[PDB]
């Protein structure tokens, strides 16, 4: 393979859409913009995600719900993240939180909660919490849940 052979696959480097370049392109004169509106102008329309022509918008006529918060903001709580039994299928011997972060299952800064979905395995599983189902599955499969705090 020499340089004059290096080629992108068909469909990898598409050409652009150049408007306002003649009659034959089919994209000229008005540049596919139509005629004479606010949308045809440079700057165009207000945010079409929100603006509805001056009427009360679809979003703003809907009620708010729940605690939104107040200064000084978020109250520091212990956070829990669940991991299903089926996720633990790969390890043997021991399982801890710090180990599951290294596997890319438990984001840092969260306390570990083991969940039910899946099959238990005779494993020592050290965690901050277990669900009713994960506890039952574990003990019944020979595993040893050691609840840490």
């Amino acid at each position: 393979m020499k340089l004059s052979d290096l080629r992108p696959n068909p469909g990898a480097n598409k050409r652009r859409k150049r408007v306002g370049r003649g009659p034959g392109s089919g994209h000229g004169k008005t540049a596919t913009r139509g005629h004479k509106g606010q949308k045809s102008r440079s700057g165009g329309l207000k945010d079409p995600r929100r603006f509805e022509g001056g009427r009360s918008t679809t979003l703003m006529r809907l009620p708010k719900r729940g605690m939104q918060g107040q200064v000084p903001g978020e109250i520091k709580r212990p956070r829990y993240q669940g991991v299903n039994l089926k996720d633990l299928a790969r390890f043997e011997g021991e399982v801890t939180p710090e180990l599951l972060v290294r596997a890319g299952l438990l984001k840092k800064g969260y306390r570990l909660k083991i969940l039910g979905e899946g099959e238990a395995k005779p494993l020592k599983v050290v965690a901050h919490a277990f669900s009713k189902s994960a506890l039952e599955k574990l003990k019944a499969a020979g595993g040893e849940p050691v609840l840490l705090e």
Binding site: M1, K2, L3, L6
Partner: protein, 49 residues
């Protein structure tokens, strides 16, 4: 990685000269043949490990 050997072959219009740490595909592909140390080949094996 032989400082001396790269000095010798620098000026040849048919030799691109290079250290193993600099092995790159654009320079492998723009040349017709490839020649390496057993030392530089060992280094290449690390990098694609």
């Amino acid at each position: 990685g032989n400082e001396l050997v790269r000095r010798a072959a620098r000026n040849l219009p048919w030799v691109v000269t290079l250290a193993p740490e600099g092995l790159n595909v654009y320079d492998i592909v723009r040349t017709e043949r490839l020649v390496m140390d057993l030392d530089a080949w060992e280094v290449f094996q690390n990098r694609i490990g």
